[PDB]
A paper describes a structure:
In D295N, the E269 was also substituted to alanine (i.e., double mutant D295N/E269A) to see its effect on isopeptide bond formation. Interestingly, this additional mutation did not affect the isopeptide bond formation in the C-domain. On the other hand, the E269A-substituted and E269A containing double mutants (to a lesser extent) displayed a minimum peak at 202 nm, suggesting the glutamate residue in the E-box of the C-domain might have some role in maintaining proper folding of GG-SpaA. Concerning the temperature-dependent CD spectral changes for the double-mutant proteins, D295N/E269A appeared comparable to that of E269A, whereas for E139A/E269A this substituted protein was lacking any obvious transition points with a rapid reduction.
Residue numbers in the entry: 39 to 302
Write the structure that this text describes.
Amino acid sequence: TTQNVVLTKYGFDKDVTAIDRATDQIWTGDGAKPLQGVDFTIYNVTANYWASPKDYKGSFDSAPVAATGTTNDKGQLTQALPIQSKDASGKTRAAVYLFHETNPRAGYNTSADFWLTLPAKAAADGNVYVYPKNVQKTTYERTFVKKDAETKEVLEGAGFKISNSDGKFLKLTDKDGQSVSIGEGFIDVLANNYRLTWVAESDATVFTSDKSGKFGLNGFADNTTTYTAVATNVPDGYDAAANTDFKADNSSSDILNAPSGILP
């Protein structure tokens, strides 16, 4: 015999803190966005808890994994969990499960570990609803516009890498650290749940000016670190732009390409 636990993950604006909801309440998150792609592990902490209930403070050391999941488009994951489980000596007991977030959405803090005993109070549909709190964190962005220095018109197709003070270069990955194919223009790290990593120059992500000259990204952690945009692919007939120091301060600024001179 199992109970269905439905976990729903909602993001609110930075200074809005949702009221807790009981397990028997179906809440639509009025005022929030569902958070997709958030990874959880559910630990079977029955044995840890029943070793000494009054001393239990959320340890999942040595606890078996009861399930793993990832939130879908509705911010949800659903898992059927046995309402009874064995303690360490093999005696059956009311099951206890601990929910541990292993991979938050880009732009969000992780939620705190929580745990519950089954059977839990269920809503009218028989499901047990939990709503872990993911607080939005401030992140920063930067946009560049590539232009022809002489005409001042926007220039498409110019390639750049971004370096930090250690001489490492930015490579975007997906939520699991795998390579992604990054196209032209401004890269919405937050919308795609990407990650910023720092690697050798030859493994770095190339950012490319689009038809409006634009490139850049969001999802930087701070606005105090200095990075450098370095030209790597120069449109034929131009001289390479000079390196551009910047901070992720949410600004747009221009990068100029001088037409190469032809003398007589």
